[PDB]
Design a protein around this ligand. Structure first.
Ligand SMILES: [Mn+2]
Ligand SMILES: [Mn+2]
Ligand SMILES: [Mn+2]
Ligand SMILES: [Mn+2]
Lengths: 198, 198, 198, 198
């Protein structure tokens, strides 16, 4: 049974970049719905797996990918943010960033473009290619999780579903993108990156 | 050259069901963007076609369907609503509903279900299957237009992208679908239906 | 644990319509590969389901849908054929066919078109819409099974993957389609149809 | 207006790796069909564009990508093979391979894997990522062209549609991939690579 992870900060901890009403709705309603529905889908899949019912297994895949991805993506998103966040990463991460994208600034333009490039619902991701030994930017639709669908390890995710910025930025997604760089918890992204080495 | 069609009513004509802030943004911002992006992409397609650049034609397909479909979908959506609508449709349309979905209420549930069932951005539609000569409900992702990607003729469309309801209903998409039944322009839906019989 | 179902007839039982080399390869190699790989995927999913690993669950969905669909689709396909097959169905099925598509002949053109319309790998299907109480034709890509992905109940399936006709018909898929109507086991399709009533 | 390009060799020039019957059918039937369907669809798109019919433009997109991509993909495929190829590439290309994939053998495994991994119809590609300035392997479904749908520049493409090998290797797709390494036209692949450095 999955559960809703608490927010490492208060709903208002990210103001003014991301107002309090968003954080509250996003975490308590949207994220909670994924967990609730994820646990239900898993129970039904467990049942179908025992009865050897492949047709039921398959029919349940959309619900599983959507709610599971939703749970995975958001669990990561909350940690990718911090009221103390902002600025540039330090050490190996910054070095890797320079090594793969050129400069921290070009990295930003690339991740911002990948995030702005999403038509419909989705996420923009900075990941790690274990196979290639280097960073990599990618975009996923709806709630498709990065690792489950691309093999890449998630380091930083930017939610560009409309519920993530509309109440404050309306249709101007570029402003939300310009604003979130101020709350990026590079401390956590560095953690995940370092984890990719071991 | 495509143009933004004026609404058949004022931004506040659908209160309290769909507020004026949503209507103004939806039309003047979202839809207007589709129009311009549609025109630009079309012109870009004209240059690629003339130069026989198939790679460019193909790279342009996502924008064409997204902005083209966006223009098609919302143009229909505005006509599907009315400050003097709601209730049950009159004439043959209602009989088709009774015949193809059992009853008006059962019809509302199915379209509401098809609408609530969109994971991510999309539209729920009541269309006409010319081949079978009867009504048929379907859901389309993002801005994919009903007829261009399915052949069914659009009769009634329900925009379930988060920008269609978030400012008013937040995450409660079912509250938005419940309210919209009050402003359905049955007259226009009947017109479209009869057209599939011209 | 799934197993490879025996063929209701010998590999040459469908000549000349579908030669023996196809039937043998199709059943013993292609179909057998699905079963082998399906059982493996299910074991891995069972493991991931216990560890609460959603990322692994999701990553395994493509393998599960492809091999499970492959196992479901082909198990049905073998029964949809018969050396004694051919002709038109009788009783309720024929009646339903006339009622939903007009005539047996128009039904054929529709199923043939849906089958010819498949770009890439896939199947053409005649199914039953439990909700609507009537027949319905649809097409599925690759090994996506009918019921698991559309809710429709499979009655007759026509495999249009290239391995199903290339050795004999090469690129002329229309000849394979024209030929298979001679081996359609209407007795089995009638069975599945009647099952949809109960 | 598009035309079927002549092969740089005779239908039997690739024996025993890819037999003459496959080469003749692949080129004279499959590819030729893409060309004509591409030209017809393009002309149909011209009429829809002129009449500003967005629904028609969109309904035509599947044929355009399928026949357009089919023409793009096979035109490249013919140039990727040679009766005087095989072995290891010479010059910078090989060094890039060593650098991006570890070694030539490791490169073959990854592309062979990406190729065997296509479920249904598709292509396995070795492309160049201009943004990152390095090699990158990717797989594309059906006839979706590499550059038009991913931005990567095609260097080497391996057709894994069943018509590319069935008449000779039957279901044993791995035997076909193993054999094709003997006719890779490294000279052409190097040319394409250097072009991403012009
Ligand atoms: Mn979100
Ligand atoms: Mn909208
Ligand atoms: Mn098959
Ligand atoms: Mn081919």
């Amino acid at each position: 049974k999955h559960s809703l992870p608490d927010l490492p900060y208060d709903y208002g901890a990210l103001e003014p970049h991301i107002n309090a009403q968003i954080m509250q709705l996003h975490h308590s309603k949207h994220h909670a719905a994924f967990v609730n529905n994820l646990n239900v889908t898993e129970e039904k899949y467990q049942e179908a797996l025992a009865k050897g019912d492949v047709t039921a297994q398959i029919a349940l895949q959309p619900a599983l990918k959507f709610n599971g991805g939703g749970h995975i993506n958001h669990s990561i998103f909350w940690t990718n943010l911090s009221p103390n966040g902002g600025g540039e990463p330090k050490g190996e991460l910054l070095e890797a960033i320079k090594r793969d994208f050129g400069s921290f600034d070009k990295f930003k333009e690339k991740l911002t473009a990948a995030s702005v490039g999403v038509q419909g619902s989705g996420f923009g991701w900075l990941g790690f290619n274990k196979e290639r030994g280097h960073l990599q930017i990618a975009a996923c639709p709806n709630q498709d999780p990065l690792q489950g669908t691309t093999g890449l390890i998630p380091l930083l995710g930017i939610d560009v579903w409309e519920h993530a910025y509309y109440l404050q930025y309306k249709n101007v997604r570029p402003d939300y993108l310009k604003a979130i760089w101020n709350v990026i918890n590079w401390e956590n992204v560095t953690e995940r990156y370092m984890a990719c080495k071991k």
